[PDB]
Write a protein that binds this DNA or RNA. Structure first.
Ligand SMILES: [Mg+2]
Ligand SMILES: [Mg+2]
Ligand SMILES: [Mg+2]
Ligand SMILES: [Mg+2]
Ligand SMILES: [Mg+2]
Ligand SMILES: [Mg+2]
Ligand SMILES: [Mg+2]
Ligand SMILES: [Mg+2]
Ligand SMILES: [Mg+2]
Ligand SMILES: [Mg+2]
Ligand SMILES: [Mg+2]
Ligand SMILES: [Mg+2]
Ligand SMILES: [Mg+2]
Ligand SMILES: [Mg+2]
Ligand SMILES: [Mg+2]
Ligand SMILES: [Mg+2]
Ligand SMILES: [Mg+2]
Ligand SMILES: [Mg+2]
Ligand SMILES: [Mg+2]
Ligand SMILES: [Mg+2]
Ligand SMILES: [Mg+2]
Lengths: 120, 145, 93
RNA sequence: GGGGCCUGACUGCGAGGCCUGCAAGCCGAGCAGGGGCGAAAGCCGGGCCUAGUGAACCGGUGGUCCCGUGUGGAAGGGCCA
RNA sequence: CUGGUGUUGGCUCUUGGUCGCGCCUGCGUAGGAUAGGUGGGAGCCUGUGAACCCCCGCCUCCGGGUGGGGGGGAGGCGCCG
RNA sequence: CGGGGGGAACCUGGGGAACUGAAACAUCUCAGUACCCAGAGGAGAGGAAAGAGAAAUCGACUCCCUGAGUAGCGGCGAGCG
RNA sequence: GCCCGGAUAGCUCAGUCGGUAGAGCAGGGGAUUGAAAAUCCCCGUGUCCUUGGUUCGAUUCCGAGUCCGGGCACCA
């Protein structure tokens, strides 16, 4: 159709409009990675910074990079997630005005994305 | 600017129902012609009552019925009718029924509230509901002699 | 005039004309070129409403209009007739 | 007039005078700090000198041992530039 | 004179702004081809019914992209290069 | 049952100047004064804290003495307080 | 003092919707009328003020500095 069902089934345990924690979703991410291989859970968050800002991530203000497999224990995802948050909060440009980290999603290699508050 | 209706108006209706109109609509059209009343907390409680008096008090003419079925229901009538086998020499109206039912036992029934159409007359055997809404099918036997 | 319920009536006010960037920012300060006396009327209107065998009109302030109705209601429970539309009014508190 | 280094077109003061109704204007040796040129003696607190200027008030900025309306902090002031 | 409001209400037609979301969008040399950036990236995709053909709306760099639909039948497709 | 009209000042409320001062003048001052109107009474007003303001404080209101020409307000002027 | 807009041929004016910088008119020639052109043809010349950094560098995109263009105010 638009997507394959292998994905259509994961849309059953991910409220379309709800913020999850790094413990409420870190374990719900290890269950939405239904592939025949060990995937890589990654996190995507939009940064409130200026793109073309030479002295201040692609060229639109998006962050990527993977951090964990699709099996890693609850203490390897819930713990390695915060290890990426502070990896950013340690490089926030001087004039980076605006919520430095507005949106934040946590999606794997083939599974959907779960909006989560990197502060709980 | 809340208001309590009357005639079920489109987009907002079913009397008693409360709705948020614009002051103008209410003051200049609704109340003038009497399509509703101001949602004053003086009729907002006055409707609280209008709503209980029927709701609770209703448990009787549609709730006490249970007392009216337990006594009957598992009961059996059987009434003396002048007949001739499979054909009575007259008939028994619902009115004919309770007529003696209020002497054979002491049970009160409203004929106009029974359920058979034509006046018995025939025979074989009878058994039919009383009324109304959550009803109770009674059991009556057409006798002999 | 005056409000037949709120009691509100016209009052005196000054029309102060000022010029100059405030001190609240910019500089030097505001300046009064001139002051004048002027009135401030009540936004009163009129509200006609049946109430028994008459219509009776109410010249009342804007932010009070509603009370007028909460009065044709409290009225209900009381007997008022005879050629007394002025009195009807009279009676309603 | 020409050239080599330089920034004293210093900060904190200022004995003692000139001028003078007031308040302004003017000259200033010398001490302290930290400097520049000189081998040193020394000179340097702009310009051979006398014009190129504007009290207060109200505000604008940059600082800052200060005040900050019950207390903390702010708001808003003061002081210095 | 005038904008916003109060007095000031029904019913429609028509458009602007904004955030939600759902969708496609993108066509310069090279190249299967109409490639938006960056990451994940060997598994996906089809009786949760794909390969092929006709119909059919929209877009047009007239090249395709792509959706509704009927049809159909066990195969599409990516890496490597 | 009452009211209405009057009363030298005094009193509360609703309205409310200009001269003058600022050695001109508009903010400011005179001044909520003069005056007009309504009302009250031998007084009138006010009155038992949604107060004051820095004190483990006080405790209706009104009047006098201080506080005090203080705190402040002010074309930071005249002046007000 | 703040918010805005910008020179590129002699003047005037557009810009991968980042790489391919091009018009009117002026000027040269030829075409040119009785007369000068209105008609007719074909081209010259460069960071697109320009500091940059993103990108493959940039004319175009961001730090953005200089000048000019229009705006809204203030003046103790
Ligand atoms: Mg983008
Ligand atoms: Mg009036
Ligand atoms: Mg005004
Ligand atoms: Mg209102
Ligand atoms: Mg002197
Ligand atoms: Mg010397
Ligand atoms: Mg000296
Ligand atoms: Mg000189
Ligand atoms: Mg010299
Ligand atoms: Mg002055
Ligand atoms: Mg304090
Ligand atoms: Mg009497
Ligand atoms: Mg009397
Ligand atoms: Mg005067
Ligand atoms: Mg004078
Ligand atoms: Mg008075
Ligand atoms: Mg006193
Ligand atoms: Mg004082
Ligand atoms: Mg005064
Ligand atoms: Mg330009
Ligand atoms: Mg011509």
């Amino acid at each position: 159709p638009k997507h394959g069902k292998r994905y259509r089934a994961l849309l059953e345990k991910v409220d379309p409009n709800k913020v999850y924690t790094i413990d409420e979703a870190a374990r719900l991410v290890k269950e939405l990675a239904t592939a025949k291989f060990d995937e890589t859970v990654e996190v995507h968050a939009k940064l409130g910074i200026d793109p073309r800002r030479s002295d201040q991530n692609d060229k639109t203000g998006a962050i990527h990079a993977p951090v964990g497999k699709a099996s890693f224990p609850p203490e390897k995802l819930a713990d390695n997630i915060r290890a990426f948050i502070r990896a950013l909060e340690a490089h926030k440009p001087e004039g980076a005005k605006g919520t430095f980290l507005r949106s934040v999603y946590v999606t794997t290699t083939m599974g959907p994305s779960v909006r989560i508050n990197p502060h709980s | 600017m809340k208001v309590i209706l009357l005639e079920p108006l489109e987009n907002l209706g079913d009397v008693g129902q409360v709705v948020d109109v614009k002051p103008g609509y209410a003051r200049n059209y609704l109340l003038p012609r009497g399509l509703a009343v101001l949602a004053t907390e003086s009729n907002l409680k006055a409707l609280e009552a209008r709503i209980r008096a029927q709701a609770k008090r209703l448990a009787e003419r549609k709730a006490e019925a249970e007392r009216l079925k337990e006594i009957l229901e598992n009961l059996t009538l059987t009434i003396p009718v002048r007949a001739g086998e499979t054909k009575i020499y007259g008939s028994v109206t619902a009115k004919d029924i309770a007529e003696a039912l209020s002497r054979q036992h002491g049970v009160t029934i409203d004929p106009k509230r029974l359920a058979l159409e034509k006046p018995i007359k025939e025979l074989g055997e009878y058994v039919l509901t009383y009324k109304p809404h959550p009803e109770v099918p009674i059991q009556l036997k057409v006798s002999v002699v | 005039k005056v409000c037949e319920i709120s009691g509100k009536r016209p009052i005196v006010a000054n029309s102060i004309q000022r010029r100059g960037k405030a001190k609240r920012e910019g500089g030097v300060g505001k300046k009064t070129t001139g002051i004048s006396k002027r009135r401030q009327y009540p936004n009163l209107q009129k509200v006609r409403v049946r109430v028994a065998g008459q219509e009776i009109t109410f010249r009342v302030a804007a932010s009070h209009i509603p009370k007028v109705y909460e009065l044709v209601e409290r009225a209900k429970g009381l007997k008022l007739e005879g050629l007394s539309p002025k009195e009807i009014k009279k009676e309603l508190l």
